[PDB]
Amino acid sequence: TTDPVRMYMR
Amino acid sequence: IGLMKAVDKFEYRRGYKFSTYATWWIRQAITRSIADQARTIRIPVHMIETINKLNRISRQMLQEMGREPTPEELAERMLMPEDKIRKVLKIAKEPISMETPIGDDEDSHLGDFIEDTTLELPLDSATTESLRAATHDVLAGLTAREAKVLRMR
Amino acid sequence: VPLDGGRFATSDLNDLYRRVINRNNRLKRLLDLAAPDIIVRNEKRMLQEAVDALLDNGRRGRAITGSNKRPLKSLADMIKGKQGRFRQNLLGKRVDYSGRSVITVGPYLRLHQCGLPKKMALELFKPFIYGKLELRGLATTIKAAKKMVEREEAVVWDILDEVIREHPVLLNRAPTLHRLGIQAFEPVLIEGKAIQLHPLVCAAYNADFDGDQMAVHVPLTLEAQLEARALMMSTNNILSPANGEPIIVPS
Amino acid sequence: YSYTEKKRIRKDFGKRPQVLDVPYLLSIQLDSFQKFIEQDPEGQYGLEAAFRSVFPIQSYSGNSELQYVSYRLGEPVFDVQECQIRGVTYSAPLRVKLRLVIYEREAPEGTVKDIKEQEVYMGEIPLMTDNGTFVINGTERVIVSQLHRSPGVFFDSDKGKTHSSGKVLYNARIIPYRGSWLDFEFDPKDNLFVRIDRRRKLPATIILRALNYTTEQILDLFFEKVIFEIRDNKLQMELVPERLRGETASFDIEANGKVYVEKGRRITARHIRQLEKDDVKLIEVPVEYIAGKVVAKDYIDESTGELICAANMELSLDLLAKLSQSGHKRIETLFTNDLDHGPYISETLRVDPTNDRLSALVEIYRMMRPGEPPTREAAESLFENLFFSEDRYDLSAVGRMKFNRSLLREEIEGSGILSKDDIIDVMKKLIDIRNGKGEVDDIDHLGNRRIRSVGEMAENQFRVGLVRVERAVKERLSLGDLDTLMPQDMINAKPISAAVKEFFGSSQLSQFMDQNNPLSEITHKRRISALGPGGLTRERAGFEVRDVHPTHYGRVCPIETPEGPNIGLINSLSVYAQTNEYGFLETPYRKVTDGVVTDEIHYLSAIEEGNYVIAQANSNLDEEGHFVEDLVTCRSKGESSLFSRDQVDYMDVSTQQVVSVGASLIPFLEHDDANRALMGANMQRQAVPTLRADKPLVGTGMERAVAVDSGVTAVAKRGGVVQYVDASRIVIKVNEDEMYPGEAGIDIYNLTKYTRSNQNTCINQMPCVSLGEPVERGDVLADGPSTDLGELALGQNMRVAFMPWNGYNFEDSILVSERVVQEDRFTTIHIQELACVSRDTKLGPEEITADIPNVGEAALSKLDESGIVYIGAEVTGGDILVGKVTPKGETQLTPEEKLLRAIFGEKASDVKDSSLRVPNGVSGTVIDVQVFTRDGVEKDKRALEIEEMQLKQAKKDLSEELQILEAGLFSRIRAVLVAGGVEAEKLDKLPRDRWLELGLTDEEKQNQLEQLAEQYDELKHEFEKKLEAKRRKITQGDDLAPGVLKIVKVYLAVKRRIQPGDKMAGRHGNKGVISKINPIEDMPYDENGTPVDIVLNPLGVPSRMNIGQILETHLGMAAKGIGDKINAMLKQQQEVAKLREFIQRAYDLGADVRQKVDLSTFSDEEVMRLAENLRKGMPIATPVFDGAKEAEIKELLKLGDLPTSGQIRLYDGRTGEQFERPVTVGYMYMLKLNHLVDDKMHARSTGSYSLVTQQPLGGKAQFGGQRFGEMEVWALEAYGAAYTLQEMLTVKSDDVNGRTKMYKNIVDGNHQMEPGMPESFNVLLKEIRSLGINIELEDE
Amino acid sequence: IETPITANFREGLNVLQYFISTHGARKGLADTALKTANSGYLTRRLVDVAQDLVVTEDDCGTHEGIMMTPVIEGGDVKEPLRDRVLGRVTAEDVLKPGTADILVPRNTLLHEQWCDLLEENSVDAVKVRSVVSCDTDFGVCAHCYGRDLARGHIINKGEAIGVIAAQSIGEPGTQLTAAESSIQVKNKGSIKLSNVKSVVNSSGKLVITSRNTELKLIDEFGRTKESYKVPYGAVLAKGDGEQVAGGETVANWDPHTMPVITEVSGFVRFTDMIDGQTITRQTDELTGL
Ligand SMILES: [Mg+2]
Ligand SMILES: [Zn+2]
DSSP: OOHHHHHHOO | OOOHHHHHHOOGGOOOHHHHHHHHHHHHHHHHHHHHHHSSSSOHHHHHHHHHHHHHHHHHHHHSSSSOTTTTHHHSSSSSOOHHHHHHHHSSSEEEEEEEEEEBBOOOBGGGHHHHHOOHHHHHHHHHHHHHHHHHHHHSSOOOHHHHHHOOO | OOOOOGOOOTTTHHHHHHHHHHHHHHHHHHHHTTHHHHHHHHHHHHHHHHHHHSTTTTTSSBBBBBOOOOOOOSGGGTOOSSSOTTSSSOOEEEESEEEEEEEEEOOOSSSEEEEEEEHHHHHHHHEEEEEEETTTTTSSSSSHHHHHHHOOHHHHHHHHHHHHOOOOOOEESSSSOGGGGGEEEEEEEEESSSSOHHHHHHHHHTTTTTSSSEEEOOOOSSHHHHHHTSSGGGOOOOOOOSSSSSSSOOO | OOOOHSSOOOOOOOOOOOSSSOOOHHHHHHHHHHHHOOOOSSSSHHHHHHHHOOOOOOOOSSEEEEEEEEEEEOOOOHHHHHHHHHOOEEEEEEEHHHHEEEEEETTTOOOOEEEEEEEEEEEEEOBOTSOOEEEEESEEEEEEEEEEEESEEEEOOOSSSSSSTTHHHHHHEEEEESSEEEEEEOOOOOOEEEEEESSOOOEEHHHHHHTTOHHHHHHHHHHHEEEEEESSSEEEEOOOOOTTTTBOOSSSSEETTEEEOOOOOOHHHHHHHHHHHOOOOOOOOOOOOOSSSSEEEEEETTOOOEEEEOSSSSOOOOHHHHHTTTTOOEEEEEEOOOOSSSSHHHHHHOOOOSSSHHHHHHHHHHHHTSSSOOOHHHHHHHHHHHHHHHHHOOHHHHHHHHHHHHTTTTTOOOSSSSSSHHHHHHHHHHHHTTTTOOOOOTTTTTTSEEOHHHHHHHHHHHHHHHHHHHHHHHHHHHHHHSSSTTTTOOOSSSSHHHHHHHHHOOOOTTTEEEOSSHHHHHHHOOOOOOSTSSOOOTTTTHHHHHHGGGTTTTOSSSOOSSSSOOOOSSOOBBOOOETTTTTTTEEEEEETTTTEEEEEEEEEHHHHHHSBBOEEEOOOEEEEEEEESSSEEEEESEEEEEEEEGGGGGEEEETTTSSTTTOOOOTTTGGGGGHEEEEEEEEGGGGOOOOOOOOOSEEESSSHHHHHSSSSSSSSSEEEEEEEEEEEEEEEEEOOOOOSSSSSSOOEEEEOOOOTTTSBOOOOOOOOOOOOOOTTTTTTTTTTTTEEEEEESSEEEEEEEEEOTTTSSSSOOEEEHHHHHHHHOOOOEEEEEEEEEEETTEEEEEESSSEEEOOHHHHHHHHHTTBBOOOTOOHHHEEEEEOOOEEOOOOOOOOOHHHHHHHTTTOOOOOOOOOEEEETTTTTTEEEEEEEOTTTSHHHHHHHHHHHHHHHHHHHHHHHHHHHHHHHHHHHHHHTTTTTTTOHHHHHTTGGGGOOOOOOOSHHHHHHHHHHHHHHHHHHHHHHHHHHHHHHHSSSSOOOTTTTEEEEEEEEEEOOOOOOOTEEEESSOOOEEEEEEEOOOGGGGGGOOOOOOOEEOOTTTTOOOBBBHHHHHHHHHHHHHHHHHHHHHHHHOOOOOHHHHHHHHTTTOOSSSSSOOOSSSSSTTTHHHHHHHHHHHHOOOOOOOOOOOOHHHHHHHTTTTOOTTTTTBBOOTTTOOOSSOEEEEEEEEEEEEEEOOOHOEEEEEHHHHEEOOOOEEEEEOOOOOOEEOHHHHHHHHHHTTTTHHHHHHTTTTTOOHHHHHHHHHHHTTTOOOOOOOOOOOOOOOOOTTTOOOOOOOOOO | OOOOOOOOOOOOOOOOHHHHHHHHHHHHHHHHHHHHHHHHHHHHHHHHHHOOBOOOOOEEEEEEEEOOOOOOOSSSSSSOHHHHTTTTSSSSOOOOEEEEEEOSSSSBOOOHHHHHHHHHTTOOOEOOOOOGGGGOOBBBBBHHEEEEEEESSOTTTTHHHHHHHHHHHGGGGGHHHHHOOEEESSSSSSSOEEEEOOOSSSSSOOOOOSOOEOOOOSSSSSSOOOEEEESSSSSEESSSSOOBBBTEOOOOOTTTTTOOOOOOOOOOOOOOBBBBBTTTOOEEEEEEE
C-alpha cells in the first residue's frame, strides 16, 4: 500500500 | 495543530528563543487531545491527572512497603476523601473487546454468552392473558355504573 | 451492556466509528483555520484510509484496535466468515425443545417406538402439560399448574401419559450424512437417564454404543406431526436410497 | 526385602534380570527449574547467564555505567496450603544488588562516587512445589515441555512437485537462536540466491561484495584455475593427469613425442596410468579450445592502460590476439567440470548488477525497506546489526556447537556471531551437495530436534523483560543529575512481573493439571509438544513430522499419543529417556566389550547411536554373560538383521524401555495389536477414583514405582517406629542413628482430608500403618487415592463371563449384575464448589440477611440467624444455600397489577430476592462453608464463630506440636543427666521447665546437652511468635476484587452411584455403556452357585484384534483359584506348616525366573499377616514384553484345581437348564471413566435468549438447546418435510413475536403457526443498508 | 519391508515386530482423520451444484434416451443387465432376435415382473430415457427419472431429487481409500469381430490392419459374458465365426514389440535412412544378422 508513514515524511 | 497556534500568537520582541516557547504550546495541544478523545468512556481532564498521579504513587510505595500498598495506604498519601480511590479505580478501567475469543478458538466468543435481561419471558405473557381473564369476570358480575366507573380508570 | 464487576464490553465497530467521527470534525476545523495544503491533504489521506478500514479492513495495512494487537472486526467481516453468512453457516442456529444424552440398547422394543427418559420428557413437554392440567380443571390457572409440577406431584405422570401417546419425536445423531440421519420415533417412558434405541436402526445411523449421543426434537404444530408420521417414521424408510436393497438387515 | 513388600509379595513372572532400575520419573520437570534459579559461579545457563548478557547498561557516552552485582531470593510470603485457598501465587520476592558508577569528565578513569544501593526489588517469580508443579492462582498448573527445531544449518530438498519439471532443488537454511533467518536457494537457471526471511529474492553473491570481496577472489575461491600457456607459439596447457576423468577427448591429446589418445576416445584407467607414469605436465592443444572458455582474472594492456578483458568473460580468437602479441605467458581460466566443479557461481555473477561494496549495500537496504532512500551510515549499520550485533544475534551456545557439528569442524565453542569464514563455508558445502557429495537432513530425525523445558523457557521470557526496561533506564541516564536519583527511581517493577505473568498465566503450554488420577498426573508432566511459541501449527504440517521415524526408539513412545485432530503432535516421553547436558535426548545402553555383557551403562545420543550396532533386549546369555548363540538378531544403521557374535557394540538395558509409563501398565501388551493399545492407554488415564482402593490382580511390576514417585502419598523421610496414628495425623519417632544431636525431634506427617480436586473428584489420604510398627526410610506411610498398600489401583476387578445375553450386549454395551451396585463398590465421590458474591450496586449494598420476602419457614429452618445454611444439612435441588437480597426501590408496576395488590394487601417490598439456590438435579451434603471478606466490611455473626474455631484449631495445633516436642526432648535430656549424676526421685519434684541450667561434669555429653538446651529455649520463644503470627494472619483483612463486598464459598459433597448410561471399559480398548442392571437371580451361574458380575459380548474380540484381554481373563481366573484354597485353609486353621507349605509352592512354579523367595520371613506374625492379604486373590506381575507364556498360565490353573480349558459350564438363571458348550469366565480389571451420565443429559423447553441475536442460550442453568447445523437441513430437504423445516428456523428460534404467539396458542390448545421474518436475516438487511447498498423488499 | 512379521497374535510379538507394527497403525488413524475432512468438503460442493432441481412435469413426451448395455469390460461381468435397467422407463420397444414382436410396449415402468420377462428372452441392449435428455426446463419430468425411493412406486410430483442424489454419492466417501502375451477364451462360444480388414500372408495369419478392432463372444441364450481386446500385431489361431473351446488360445503377440506390417510383397527400398542421419549399423556374426 506504499505504507502511509513514508509518503507524509516525503 | 499545536504548532499552527503558536505561530499566530508569537512576538519576537520578547527575546524568547522560539524553540522552548513553542514547545510549551505544542505539548499543551498533545495532552488536551490525548485526554479528550482516546477514551471510549470519556472522563473529565482533572480525573485523568488524578489517575496519572496514582500510577506514580503505586511505584514509589511498592518497594518501600515490601509488597505493594494496601488499597487504604495510598489513601493517606492522597489529599482527598480517601474512600474515593475505590470509586476512581472503578471507572478507571477500559472496556473490553466484545469479540474477545473465549477458549477452544471456536466461534463461541465472549459476547455470544451475554444474555438478554430486557426480555419478557413467555410464562409471564401467559399469565398476562389469564390476568385479563380473571379481572373481567369479577367486573361483569357487578352493577353497570361500577363497570363504567372502573372502565374509565 | 454492563458486565459483572462493573467492567464494560463493547463492539469493535465503536473504536472504528469514533475515529471516523473525530477525523471528520478535525477537518471541518482546519478548513476554517485556512491551514496549509500540506496538512489538509494529509488529513484527507487519513480519513480516506480510516473509512476504508471501517468498511472492509484488509485491503490496506490493517489498522489495529487501541492498545490491542488483535485486529478489529469490520462491517465486511460481519457478513463474511467461514463460509459466507454465519447464521446459515454451520452451526447453524440453536433450536428450542431439544436435548440429548447417551444412548443405550433395549432389545425388547418394537421397531416403531423408542425409549425416552421419564426425567427428560417431563422438562421437554412442559407447555403441553400446563395446558392439559388446567384444561381438565386439575389446575385453576397456569400459575397454579407451574407450582404443581415444581412440587413434582404424582398426579402429573398420569397426565403425561395422555399427552405423550400419539405424538412422535425426531431422533438425530451427530454427522447427518444421508437422509436416514433423522428418523421419527414414538416415545415410551423409561426410568433411567439414557435413551433406548431399537437395535436394528443402529445400522442406518452408523451408531455404535461407545458413548455416542443423539438429539431429540419435538414436532410442535399439528401439521408437523402428520408430516413426521407419513414421511419420517421408521417403518416407512426400510430401503436404502442408494441401492434398492433393505438397510434394516440384521446386524 | 523392604517393609511394604514384606507385607504382601507379588508373584513375578519374567525371566530377563533387571540390570538397571527405573529412575525418578519426575526428573525432567524438577531438574529444569532447579537449573534456572540457582547460583552458578560461571557463565553457564541460569539467571546469572541471562543477567550478564544485557548488563552493564551505560548512558549515551556520558560515562555513567550501571554494572550488575548479585541477587537474592526472599522467603515465600505464604506456604503451599495457605496460598491455594486465598488465590495468591506461590512466589518469592526478587531483591537484586546494583552499583551505579559515574566517571568524571574528562577522566583518566575513576569515579566521583558509586552508590552500592541495597537490593532494589524487581517483581516476584513463582516457585515450584516439591513435586514439580506451580500454583498460579490457587490452581495447580503444569508447564508442558516444548519441542522445536535445533539451531544450526539444515539442507533440504523439495524434489518433484517443484515447478512441474521434476528437476530437483537443494536449499540451505541458517536458523539462529535469535535474529533473522538466512536462506540460500537455487533456481532452474542454476543461479544462487539468498533471501531475508520471506522477502524479495536476490542474487546470492551480492553479500560478498558487501563483505569486501571483489570479483577475482570470488572466482578464486569456488573454482580451480586452468592456466593456458603460450609456449614457443600458439597455446599449450598445464595438465593434471586426473582432470580428464569423466570426459572424452577434445582433440589429438599428445605429449612426450607420442600420441596417447586421439579425438573421440574416452579417457580411462589405461590412459591415466600412462600420463601419471610418464609425468605428463604439459600438452599441446588447438587455439580453438578457448573459443568458449571463460578467462579467470583481469588482464589490461600494459602500454595504453586500456581494458583487454574483464573477469568472467568468454574469450574469442580476436580477444586472444590482443594479449598474445603483448607477451603474456599466463592466461588463467576456470576449471569447469559438470561432474566435479559445476559452473554455478559463474552464472550467478552475470546477473549481479553490483561491482563494488556500496553498490550492494544499497541494494540490500533497498530490498529490506524499499521506497525510502539509502544512506551510507544507514546501510552499513543495518547490515552490521543483522549477523554481527552482540545484542540481536547468538546462534546459542548449543547452536554454535551444532553449527560446527554440521560443518565437520573440531572446535565446539567460539564467536556468538557469524564470521566471514562461516558464511562462505556454508555456501561451499551447499554446492558440494548439489555436486552430488553428501545428503540432506530430515527434520523428523531426533538428532535435529532439541528439547527445551520450563527452566529454559522462563529464562527467555525474563530475558525479553530486561531488553524493554533498558531503554527506560537509558532514557533517564541521559539527562540524569548527579547524586539525586539512586538505582531504584528509574527501574520499574511491573514491566518485568507482567512479562513473567504473561507466560505462566496464559500460554498454550500452561494448563490445569489433569489430576483425577495418580497415573494422569505423572503422564502429563512427562509430555512433549510441538505446538505453541516457536513451533508448528496444525494447519501447517503436514504428515511427514507426525509419522514415526526410526530414531524414536527408546526416546519417544511410539504408541502413546492422542487419537484426535493432533496425532503425532504430542509423543509422550519414554521411561528411561533423559535430557542431554546440551539438551538433546539420550538413552541408556550396556557396554558390550566383545564377549562380556558388562553392567556398566553408557548413555548414547541420537547421532551416536546410529553408527554402532546395538543388540536386542531379548537375548539369551548364560554362565558369565557371554552371548549363548553365535549369531544374534541386531540393528545398526536404521535396519535390523542377523549379525556375528563379536560384532555387537552395545545392548539394550531393559525389555521395557520402548514404551511409556502409561503404556507399561497394561498386561499382556505383547499379544495386542498396536491400534487397540493406543485406545487402551488413552482411557487408562481418565479413570475416576473409586470408593475402595482395590489392586490389580494382573499387574506388571511398575505400579510400585509409579505410586511412590507420584506425590499423593506420604513417604517416610527417616526410619523409626510409630508413636501415634490418628485418622488426622501420623507421628513417627525417629531412630537413633540418623538423628542429629540438637534439633533431633520427631517426623510428623499431617494428612490431607476431603478436598476438591481439579476435576471435581475427591482427594483423600488414609493411614496404612498401625501403632508401634517398624518403618524404614522411603516407606509408604499412608495411601493416596487409587492406591492400596503401596500399589497403584485405578479400579476394581470383577468376575466377568463372555456370552450373548438376550441382546443386552448387542454392540459393545455392558450388562451388570446387581451385586456390583449393591456393594457400593463403583460408587464415586464428587465435590462441587458453589460461591456467592455480595456485590455493590449504585443503589446500595446487598445484604446476606435471612429476611426474604414471601418465603416460608421451610427454607429458614435450614438457615441460621445470619443467613448461612448449617454444616451437615443434607440438601437437594432448589434449597437456598445463601439468602441474599438486592436493593430495588420504585418498581413502577402497571395498573391492573397495582389495583390487584391493593385488593389483597401485600406490602410491596423495595428489595429483590437474589438468593443463591442449588442447581436442579444435583444433591449432596454440605461439608464446609468459607467466608472471605473485604478489609473494612464488617464481619458478620457466623464469621466470628468461624474465626473462633479457626483460632481454637490453630491454638490446639501449635500446642500439640509443642507438647509432643517438649516431652520428647526433655525425656532424653533427663536420661543423659542420669548418666553421671542420677538423683531419680530428687529430680522430678521440681518443675521440669527448670532443668536446662543443671550441668554435667567434663565430657562432650555436657556439650551435647548444650545443643538440646539451645533449641529448647528457642522452642519456648518460637512457639510464642508462631502462635502470635498465625493468630494475626486470621483476623487480617482479606483483599478482594473491586466492587465485591464479601464472598461465601460453599462446598457440596455429592455421592454418585452407577446407573444405565455410564461409560466403562477394560484396559484393552473395549469400551461400553452399562445397559440394564439385573437381579442376581437372573445371572448365569455355575455349579457352585456363585453368580457372575458382568456379561461381555464375544463378538468384540475377533474384529478388533485385541487378544490380550482373553489371556488376562484366563490368568485372572487362576489367581482367584489360589485365593479360595488359602481362604479355606485359613478358616480351617489347620496349622502354620500346611499354610506355609502351600504358599511356598505357589511362589516357585517351574523353573527359570528371577524371584528368590522365602523361608526367611518371620515364621509366625508375618506369614499370618501375609496370609490375610492374599485371600482376596494373589497379585501377579506380567512384565510388558517379558510376559507370561501360555504353558505357565495353564500350569497355574492345575494347582487351582480348575480345568485346563479355562472354560466351565454355566446355567441360565431363568430356565435353569445347562448351556451347550463350555464358556469362558475369569477376572478382568475394569475402570469407570468420567463420562458420567447426569452431566451429559440436557433438556430445555423455553429459556434465555441471546441479546444481539435472539437465539437460545443457557443462562439460568435451564441449559441451551441443541445446535441444528448445516447437514441436518439437507436431511429435511431430502424428505418432503416442508413444514418441519420452516418450524425449525422460524417459531422455534428467530421469530421474537411468533414464539410468544405460539406459546400462547399452546396453552390455549391451538396448534398453529404465524411465521413472519427471521431476525438473523433482518439484521443482515440493516448491516447491508449501512453499507452503500440500497436493499429493499419489493412487491408488485 | 523384506522381512515379514513371522509371529502371530496367539504367541507374543517381540520388540521389532511391535515397533514395525506401530507405523501402519499410526498412519491408519492419521489417514481416516483426513478422509473425514475430504468427504465433508466433497458433499458440500455437490449439493450446491445440484439442489434447485425438482420433479416438475409428469411426462415431457420426448422419445429420446440413452442406450443401456451390459458392463462387461474385458474381465468379469461385474454387473448384470437386470440391475441397470430395473426401475427405468424404456426409450423404445425392445424386440426379440425375430420381429413383428412387441415384447415390452414402449413407455413401461420396468418393475420386477417386466425385468424377469426380459431375462426370459435373450434381450441384449435397451435404449432407456434418462434425466440428461428430458426436454422440460427448470426441472426433470417424472418419467425420465425412474422409480426409486424408499417406496417402490414411480416418483411423485414435487420430490426434491437433487438433494437425495448428492447425499447418496457423498456418504460412502469415508469408506474409500508386462505379461501381455496371449488371450485364452475361457468359455465355449462364437466369435464376432468388429472393424478389421485382413490379408493372408505366407504364414497364414489373420492380420489386423486397424486400430479399433474388438474380439467379442457371441452367446446362445442371452449372456454375452466375455469380451477381449486384441492389439495391433497379434498372431491369431481362430478366424471369424469359428467356434472356440473352453480355455483356448486364440491370440498371440510379443508384449514389447509393435510390428509395422504391410499388406503387400516386394523388395525394401531405403529412403532417408542414411548411416549417421537416422540409423547406424549393428551387424552380427557368420549368420548374417
Ligand atoms: Mg462409535
Ligand atoms: Zn423428460
